[PDB]
């Protein structure tokens, strides 16, 4: 039998959230601004296929997100999101979007000015989990030195980095239009 | 050949504003204990049998203590919350410790006997998954109320043959569960 490659035997990995959480709380303003999705592992929830541009505004208690790009049907699309602390006090953020589920979102590693390596995982009741990983860049491109940092981070939590797929970005993307949606 | 909870098409349009208008003044009457009578295939629900959900309303949200027997046969408690959708959408979010949060619509309830609950998520490939539940104030639920939920789910084109009954009743250690 075959199943989606994002449904994986066993439980979600450990991932040292308290340390990350404590590193990241002082730095929220530095995480704000525009992040481009450089690559992601197979994600059946992401409605934006190409030119994925995530604009974050920090209001002192959460991030308000405008996510834009080209949808799977070829039209421009804007999605309104939020990133806020997990409501049970767990050491991670919840990422939430209009007309969507909300999920944990761990920042496995970031330097704030070039890249971010993001991770979400869910355990199922039948001995499997699904996880969803992302490489974010402050630009349309991302140098291999930074990509390799994320590769290391994901390998360290036993994520198969051959699962990453690059997202269309760059001069073919109507970013100046997207930012006005 | 794909799971029976991955269904073609978009999530149904459900008439959430009418339901929110009806329900928002009655939150207090939704508190207390609800047993899960039946549900459609759900890969997220960690409690297999004897599912007992105790709701406390604080004015703004519900706190939930869910107990029963896990899939390994051991007792389990899960902590949940049910709060208004943070974007101001006319539905609640159901959230549990160390899980995802999802929309949760009350398609129909009489507060004193039954509730018919519904969640749906859209995929980027044009299918959806929905997750439906029949709750009862008791371990059993009279047929008339089962039928009311069936009609409410059929009205939004959820295939009610997907429901499976949850173990409830004498085989269940509720007084231990109350305790957890």
From Swiss-Prot, chain B:
PANTHER family: APOLIPOPROTEIN D. It is found in: Secreted, Extracellular space. Its main location: secreted. It comes from the Eukaryota. Found in the carapace. Gene3D superfamilies: 2.40.128.20. This is Crustacyanin-C1 subunit. SUPFAM superfamilies: Lipocalins. The keyword Secreted applies. It holds the Pfam family Lipocalin. Keywords: Disulfide bond, Pigment, Secreted, Transport. It comes from Homarus gammarus. One of its GO terms (biological process) is lipid metabolic process. One of its GO terms (molecular function) is pigment binding. Disulfide bonds join 11-120, 50-172, 116-149. The lineage of its organism: Eukaryota, Metazoa, Ecdysozoa, Arthropoda, Crustacea. Oligomer; Can form dimers (beta-crustacyanin); or complexes of 16 subunits (alpha-crustacyanin). There are five types of subunits: A1, A2, A3, C1 and C2. Binds the carotenoid astaxanthin (AXT) which provides the blue coloration to the carapace of the lobster.
């Amino acid at each position: 039998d075959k199943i989606p490659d994002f449904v994986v035997p066993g439980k979600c990995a450990s991932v040292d959230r308290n340390k990350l959480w404590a590193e990241q709380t002082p730095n929220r303003n530095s995480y704000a601004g525009v992040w481009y999705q450089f690559a992601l592992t197979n994600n059946p929830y992401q409605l934006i296929e190409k030119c994925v541009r995530n604009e974050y505004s920090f209001d002192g208690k959460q991030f308000v997100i405008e996510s834009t790009g080209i949808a799977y049907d070829g039209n421009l699309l804007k999605r309104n999101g939020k990133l806020y602390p997990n409501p049970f006090g767990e050491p991670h953020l919840s990422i939430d979007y209009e007309n969507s589920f909300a999920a944990p979102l761990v920042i496995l590693e970031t330097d704030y000015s070039n890249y971010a390596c993001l991770y979400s995982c869910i355990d199922y009741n039948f001995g499997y989990h699904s996880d969803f990983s992302f490489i974010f860049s402050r630009s349309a491109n991302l140098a291999d030195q930074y990509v390799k940092k994320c590769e290391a981070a994901f390998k360290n939590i036993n994520v198969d980095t051959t699962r990453f797929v690059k997202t269309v970005q760059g001069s073919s993307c109507p970013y100046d239009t997207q930012k006005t949606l």
